[PDB]
Amino acid sequence: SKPNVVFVLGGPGSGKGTQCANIVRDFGWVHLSAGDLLRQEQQSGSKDGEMIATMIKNGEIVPSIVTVKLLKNAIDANQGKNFLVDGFPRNEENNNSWEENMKDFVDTKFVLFFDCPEEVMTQRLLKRGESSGRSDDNIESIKKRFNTFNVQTKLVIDHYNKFDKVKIIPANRDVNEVYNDVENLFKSMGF
Ligand SMILES: Nc1ncnc2c1ncn2[C@@H]1O[C@H](COP(=O)(O)OP(=O)(O)O)[C@@H](O)[C@H]1O
Ligand SMILES: Nc1ccn([C@@H]2O[C@H](COP(=O)(O)O)[C@@H](O)[C@H]2O)c(=O)n1
Ligand SMILES: [Mg+2]
């Protein structure tokens, strides 16, 4: 059987990583955060390491050739699992590179979009920046991430939305109120 994939999209700090951990716990899917995979590769001392570092700091999207490879390696090592790919696709290139490399290998079911206001994401991110130790949790990078989201990623969401493949969860609530709807959706989808 081909894996099922759900793209988990949303703004910076909309809660994609938080809710994905809940889904892993209750449904046993594998959580692939693209942001985490890219950081990991950078921590590993690769060729692409100093490039990844600069782009993350400035809220730019890394070349897909790096990201899709990192996702494919993890997916190929976990035969028989379903996948939450978190924070991807974030632009058209991301999307095209996915469909070029993955389309006959997986079943991408829907985009789960966490909708949250910028003001709330900014606050969540400054708070997370006190302990995360991420290079992009400050208020310079945060605002760069917002622009990239607005200019590149919103187009991807509306592209899936015309094929009816976006589910929207409003994310400006308690973490458990948000998870209740997420759990209900995954149950209603037969997972
Ligand atoms: N519903 C929520 N309400 C308040 N804090 C939240 C909520 N969801 C997540 N957080 C906090 O917001 C920050 C961003 O969450 P995270 O899941 O890491 O975001 P993302 O992966 O979308 O960038 C974290 O510190 C997290 O603990
Ligand atoms: N598809 C993706 C996902 C993450 N990223 C990079 O990783 C950064 C951190 O993303 P996360 O917030 O998802 O960890 C993004 O702002 C971006 O610089 C990327 O370049 N391509
Ligand atoms: Mg995250």
CSV table of C-alpha atoms in Angstrom, one decimal, residues 23-112:
chain,number,residue,atom,x,y,z
A,23,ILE,CA,-1.8,13.2,15.9
A,24,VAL,CA,1.3,11.0,16.1
A,25,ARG,CA,0.2,10.1,19.6
A,26,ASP,CA,-3.4,9.1,18.8
A,27,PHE,CA,-3.2,7.8,15.2
A,28,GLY,CA,0.4,6.6,14.8
A,29,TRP,CA,1.3,8.6,11.7
A,30,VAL,CA,4.9,9.7,11.3
A,31,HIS,CA,5.6,13.4,11.7
A,32,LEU,CA,8.0,14.9,9.2
A,33,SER,CA,8.6,18.6,9.9
A,34,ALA,CA,10.4,20.0,6.9
A,35,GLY,CA,11.8,22.8,9.0
A,36,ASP,CA,13.2,20.3,11.4
A,37,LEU,CA,14.7,18.2,8.7
A,38,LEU,CA,16.4,21.2,7.2
A,39,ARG,CA,17.8,22.3,10.6
A,40,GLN,CA,18.9,18.7,11.1
A,41,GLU,CA,20.8,18.6,7.9
A,42,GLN,CA,22.5,21.9,8.8
A,43,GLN,CA,23.5,20.4,12.2
A,44,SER,CA,25.1,17.5,10.3
A,45,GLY,CA,27.7,19.6,8.5
A,46,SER,CA,26.6,19.1,4.9
A,47,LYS,CA,27.6,21.1,1.7
A,48,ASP,CA,24.2,22.8,1.9
A,49,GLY,CA,24.6,23.6,5.6
A,50,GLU,CA,25.7,27.2,5.5
A,51,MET,CA,23.1,27.9,2.7
A,52,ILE,CA,20.3,26.4,4.8
A,53,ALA,CA,21.4,28.5,7.8
A,54,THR,CA,21.3,31.8,5.9
A,55,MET,CA,18.0,31.1,4.3
A,56,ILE,CA,16.3,30.1,7.5
A,57,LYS,CA,17.6,33.2,9.3
A,58,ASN,CA,16.0,35.3,6.5
A,59,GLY,CA,12.8,33.4,6.2
A,60,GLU,CA,13.5,32.3,2.6
A,61,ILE,CA,12.4,29.0,1.1
A,62,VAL,CA,15.3,26.6,0.6
A,63,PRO,CA,15.7,25.1,-3.0
A,64,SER,CA,13.3,22.1,-3.3
A,65,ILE,CA,16.0,19.8,-4.5
A,66,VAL,CA,17.4,19.8,-0.9
A,67,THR,CA,14.0,19.6,0.9
A,68,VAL,CA,12.3,17.0,-1.2
A,69,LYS,CA,15.3,14.7,-0.9
A,70,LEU,CA,15.2,15.0,2.9
A,71,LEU,CA,11.5,14.1,2.9
A,72,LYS,CA,11.9,11.2,0.5
A,73,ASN,CA,14.7,9.6,2.5
A,74,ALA,CA,12.6,9.6,5.7
A,75,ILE,CA,9.6,8.3,3.8
A,76,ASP,CA,11.5,5.5,2.1
A,77,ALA,CA,12.9,4.4,5.5
A,78,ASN,CA,9.3,4.1,6.9
A,79,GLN,CA,7.5,1.6,4.7
A,80,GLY,CA,4.0,0.9,5.9
A,81,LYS,CA,3.5,4.3,7.6
A,82,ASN,CA,1.3,7.3,6.9
A,83,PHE,CA,2.9,10.8,6.9
A,84,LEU,CA,2.2,14.2,8.2
A,85,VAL,CA,4.4,16.5,6.2
A,86,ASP,CA,4.5,19.7,8.2
A,87,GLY,CA,5.4,23.0,6.6
A,88,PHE,CA,5.6,21.8,3.0
A,89,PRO,CA,4.8,22.7,0.3
A,90,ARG,CA,5.6,26.4,1.0
A,91,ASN,CA,5.8,27.6,-2.6
A,92,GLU,CA,5.1,26.5,-6.2
A,93,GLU,CA,8.6,25.0,-6.6
A,94,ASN,CA,8.0,22.9,-3.5
A,95,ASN,CA,4.7,21.7,-4.9
A,96,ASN,CA,6.1,21.0,-8.4
A,97,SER,CA,9.1,19.1,-7.0
A,98,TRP,CA,6.8,17.0,-4.8
A,99,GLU,CA,4.6,16.1,-7.8
A,100,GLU,CA,7.7,15.3,-9.9
A,101,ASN,CA,9.3,13.0,-7.3
A,102,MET,CA,6.5,11.6,-5.1
A,103,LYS,CA,3.2,11.5,-7.0
A,104,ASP,CA,3.3,7.8,-8.0
A,105,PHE,CA,4.7,6.8,-4.6
A,106,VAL,CA,2.2,8.3,-2.2
A,107,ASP,CA,-1.5,9.2,-1.9
A,108,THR,CA,-1.7,12.9,-0.8
A,109,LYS,CA,-5.1,13.2,0.7
A,110,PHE,CA,-5.6,16.8,1.9
A,111,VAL,CA,-4.0,20.0,3.1
A,112,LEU,CA,-4.7,20.7,6.8
